[PDB]
GTP-binding protein
Amino acid sequence: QNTLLKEAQDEISNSIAKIDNLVLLLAKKLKERLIDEFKYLKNNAQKLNLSRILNIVDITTKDGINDILREIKFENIKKIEELKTNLSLKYDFLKDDFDNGFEGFKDGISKNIDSIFQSEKFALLRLKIEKNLKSDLYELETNLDTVIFDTFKEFKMSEILNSLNINGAFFEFLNDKLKH
């Protein structure tokens, strides 16, 4: 029991000691929209292509969510390795897996919500742009608007990542309390 208490203290000491992807996805979506506009210019322009333009927003949101899910999986793998390191408490290690999964689900829901708001704002901006012009000037306007949208997406990534880090720290504290 004394050795287990010492190991728990060491784990607590270790715990005390120890945006760009969304922007890239937004840039890729803007490039896809520009390619669609160029294709429309080669042919003559349709409303169906404009309607399809808004689906690229959902695709970009899905890509960002994929990155977030990969990060959550990496965090879970790190937690499993930490549990494996030294044999201090097995039941406590088993318990926190459900809490980690719940935290990941909450992070995914927050990504869905905020990214969906961002995608809706981007769609509204695209509709306003359509409400027309010299093709190169239209492409430049789309670059400006989607650059603002990409900055908003990067800010969302930063703030949500800070929130996710805080949630992970809280989960680690709960696991330490359970071990105690």
